[PDB]
């Protein structure tokens, strides 16, 4: 080690700490929501507190931190992350004991957590611009993309530790170390269970303090705001690349948020041993292509454009592997088994289920032996049911030509589709593995191009403003508009106990497939068009 490799070790440890902090935030939210007895809007305000605290100070710390001692401010920010991690687990330590206490036949402690999220927002401020500028200003020429691939590979260790510690600490009770465990009457499958959410934030806070330790032992060298912000914003290639990476990252975010719901509606499977080493090998392979081939600035830009072309070339093959529409009574066709419907809004009742006085808004999916799913066992005509095996006898809403055996023997749940589109589901997950591998080969080039576009005195400000646009308009508003364009195609709306915004149970699978592939595909096509404009104007400039 020549000292600078110690900075890469400390930056790898800080990336492990920030990835761990994000997985611990996204993992233990239901224990906080059940423990503090707060509503959905309040716990969403807790969850958005981190984005508020990061987005408020990211541009000012990324501007003012580059002139100062950079790894000292990274250590100060990681210590602030550790203080927030201790402060998030701190409401467990002084509120006392936690207290918790269908046949279908025809209270103000959360502000602590809020402040901890704000502190953790400051804890994710100084790491990503400043030290990456410290990679580009002090490593040798061509070595920096290899270091970016190395730290993006080592930052995947953090979600693995986050999943393992989240599942292990959600296994036991919240009050372990204080009560006798034989007195607990509830299970982890019970609705009143609260896992040990504080152990997650305690390991996150102490690991952030140990990651804040070795930054203070590194040397500074191994051997106005408005005018500078105007000089960044009036650069046309930079703002074109920021709008480009905003469209591409927004396509990625709106893709992978709803892949498992697309699996549940289209291919019928409920919701990564191999996936995370594939992504880590993709990032390290892309860093090795940029390092080994001695690519210049427009070469890195054409390499990112070629990975975008390759990823979109397999992304457009999702349209040809669609399975059929599911057969549901009362949503896509009538209850009697004969006639389709024009629309799913306020369907008429049939003669078989007219005597059945159950709730039409109640959702409990069953299917018969004909392969047609029914939305409730009351509207399936089933009058008697058995128990660990599932059987609904004497169902009267399945009309055939006098078959005696085709009136009963129905189980619960969505029974799966034919075997023709299970192989198409395997094709979908194989092409998704290929698309995520080519997105990983895209990878470090988005970070690597920014420090070569802008001036060498303003690399950290450019990285901070790019982090503002990517984390702000991609991380927040893009799940909102993909959620709007996905939930506009619901077919069975759930009547919630409180009010509106209930999660719809099933979808119109071809229409939801069309809108979910279409918005992401048009966003990626417009992003690729902005790559072609960027290559043409960037070769014109160079």
């Amino acid at each position: 080690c020549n000292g600078l490799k110690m900075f890469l070790a400390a930056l790898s440890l800080s990336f492990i700490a920030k990835t761990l902090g994000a997985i611990i935030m996204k993992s233990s939210i239901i224990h906080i929501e059940r423990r503090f007895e707060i509503s959905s809007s309040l716990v969403g305000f807790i969850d958005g507190s981190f984005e508020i605290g990061n987005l408020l100070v990211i541009v000012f710390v990324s501007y003012f931190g580059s002139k100062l001692h950079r790894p000292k401010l990274i250590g100060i920010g990681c210590f602030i992350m550790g203080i927030g991690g201790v402060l998030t687990a701190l409401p467990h330590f002084f509120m006392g004991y936690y207290r918790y206490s269908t046949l279908s036949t025809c209270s103000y402690m959360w502000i602590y957590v809020f402040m901890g999220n704000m502190l953790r927002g400051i804890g994710e401020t100084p790491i990503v611009p400043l030290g990456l500028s410290y990679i580009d200003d002090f490593a040798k020429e061509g070595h920096s993309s290899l270091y970016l691939g190395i730290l993006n590979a080592i930052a995947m260790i953090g979600p693995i530790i986050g999943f393992t510690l989240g599942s292990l600490f959600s296994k036991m009770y919240v009050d372990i170390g204080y009560v006798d465990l034989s007195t607990i009457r509830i299970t982890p499958t019970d609705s009143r269970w609260v896992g040990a959410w504080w152990l997650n934030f305690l390991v996150s806070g102490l690991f952030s303090i140990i990651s804040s330790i070795p930054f203070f032992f590194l040397p500074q060298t191994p051997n106005g705001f408005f005018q500078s912000f105007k000089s960044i914003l009036t650069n046309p290639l930079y703002v074109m690349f920021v709008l480009l990476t905003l469209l591409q990252v927004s396509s990625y975010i709106g893709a992978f948020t709803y892949v498992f719901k697309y699996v549940e509606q289209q291919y019928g499977q409920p919701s990564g041993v191999i996936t995370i080493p594939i992504f880590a090998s993709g990032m390290f392979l892309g860093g090795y292509i940029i390092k080994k081939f001695k690519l210049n600035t427009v070469g890195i830009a054409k390499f990112s454009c070629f990975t975008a072309v390759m990823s979109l070339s397999f992304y457009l093959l999702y349209f040809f592997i669609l399975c059929e529409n599911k057969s549901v009574a009362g949503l896509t066709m009538t209850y009697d088994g004969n006639n389709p419907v024009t629309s799913h809004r306020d369907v008429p009742l049939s003669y078989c289920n007219s005597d059945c006085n159950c709730d039409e808004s109640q959702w409990e999916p069953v299917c018969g032996n004909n392969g047609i799913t029914y939305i409730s066992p009351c509207l399936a005509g089933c009058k008697s049911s058995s128990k660990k095996p599932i059987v609904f006898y004497n169902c009267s809403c399945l009309e055939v030509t006098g078959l005696q055996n085709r009136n009963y023997s129905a189980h619960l749940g969505e029974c799966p589709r034919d075997d023709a589109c299970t192989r198409k589901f395997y094709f979908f997950v194989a092409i998704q593995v290929l698309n995520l591998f080519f997105s990983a080969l895209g990878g470090t080039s988005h970070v690597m191009l920014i420090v070569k576009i802008v001036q060498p005195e303003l690399k950290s400000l450019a990285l901070g403003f790019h982090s503002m646009v990517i984390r702000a308009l991609g991380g927040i508003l893009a799940p909102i508009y993909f959620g709007a364009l996905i939930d506009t195609t619901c077919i069975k709306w759930s009547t919630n106990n409180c009010g509106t915004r209930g999660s719809c149970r099933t979808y119109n699978s071809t229409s939801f497939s069309r809108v979910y592939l279409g918005l992401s595909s048009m966003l990626r096509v417009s992003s690729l068009v902005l790559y072609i404009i960027l290559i043409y104007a960037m070769k014109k400039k160079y």
Binding site: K18, T19, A22, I23, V128, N152, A155, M156, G158, P159, V249, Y252, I253, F256, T257, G272, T275, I276, F279, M283, S439, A440, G443, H446, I470, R471, G474, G475
Partner: peptide, 11 residues
């Protein structure tokens, strides 16, 4: 990685 969000700053 998995997931949701992105970045790619994570996973």
């Amino acid at each position: 990685x998995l997931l949701v969000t992105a970045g790619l700053v994570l996973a």
